[PDB]
Design a protein around this ligand. Structure first.
Ligand SMILES: Cc1cc2nc3c(=O)[nH]c(=O)nc-3n(C[C@H](O)[C@H](O)[C@H](O)COP(=O)(O)O)c2cc1C
Lengths: 55, 141, 49
């Protein structure tokens, strides 16, 4: 049951302000296709979100 | 990183993805054009074009990409807010050791008008050296 | 072999997933091993298998 963790991580990725819809769909589909990897995929989304922060 | 330390306008695209989208845009390019990373990553660079852009020029770029070769041209581009600028533009593919195309590099130099003679020679030298720097910086990606 | 070419060789990643990894590779090249590890894990998971 990575079920709660999967939905939790999907929700967070959805709310990342610096990602576009293509990038959000990439990570959210990744999660639902490999829930066991929920944590690692969430971390990667956050690193991508920070790299795309305004300067 | 060395790619981030390159203080020039450039983008890098991936022709192996449908419609050849931008996968990296320099800090200078984004601030010059008034776009953000979230806005233009994943987009074909043709969004820079508009009403006063010369169609035959854009055709030369199309053809060079089809043939997988270099090209250097000048054409009218627009910022996000709609301000015009001349772009001295150079394109060139990055290849692996077997010659297969991995990415295209594009380097921009802004002007207020079409340049020729020595002014153009200098600009071309600057952008071509930059492209070689970019190719060297990204050769493991 | 280069990171991008490796990402593209993977049969069972979709276009958006491929794009996402490549952009990640370019923004933080020091994470390339971790990114390629992950892409292979996903490709294993999405196989028709
Ligand atoms: C690496 C790269 C950088 C690009 N940079 C620009 C640019 O700065 N200005 C521009 O007008 N087009 C640029 N383009 C060209 C367009 O993306 C596109 O290839 C051109 O319009 C092709 O013609 P088409 O619109 O008929 O397909 C770039 C293309 C590549 C591959």
């Amino acid at each position: 049951k990575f079920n709660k963790e999967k939905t939790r991580a999907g929700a967070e990725i959805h709310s990342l302000p610096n990602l576009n819809v293509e990038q959000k769909f990439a990570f959210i589909v990744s999660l639902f296709d490999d829930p066991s990897q929920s944590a690692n995929l969430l971390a990667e989304a956050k690193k991508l979100n920070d790299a795309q922060a305004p300067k | 990183t060395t790619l981030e330390r390159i203080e020039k306008n450039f983008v890098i695209t991936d022709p192996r993805l449908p419609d050849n989208p931008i996968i990296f845009a320099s800090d200078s390019f984004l601030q010059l054009t008034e776009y953000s990373r979230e806005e233009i990553l994943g987009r074909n660079a043709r969004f820079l074009q508009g009403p006063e852009t010369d169609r035959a020029t854009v055709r030369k770029i199309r053809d060079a990409i089809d043939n997988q070769t270099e090209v250097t041209v000048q054409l009218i581009n627009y910022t996000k807010s709609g301000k015009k600028f001349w772009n001295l533009f150079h394109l060139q593919p990055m290849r692996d050791q077997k010659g297969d195309v991995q990415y295209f590099i594009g380097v921009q130099l802004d002007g207020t008008e079409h340049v020729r003679d020595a002014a153009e020679r200098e600009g071309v030298m600057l952008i071509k050296k930059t492209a070689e720097n970019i190719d060297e910086a990204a050769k493991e990606l």
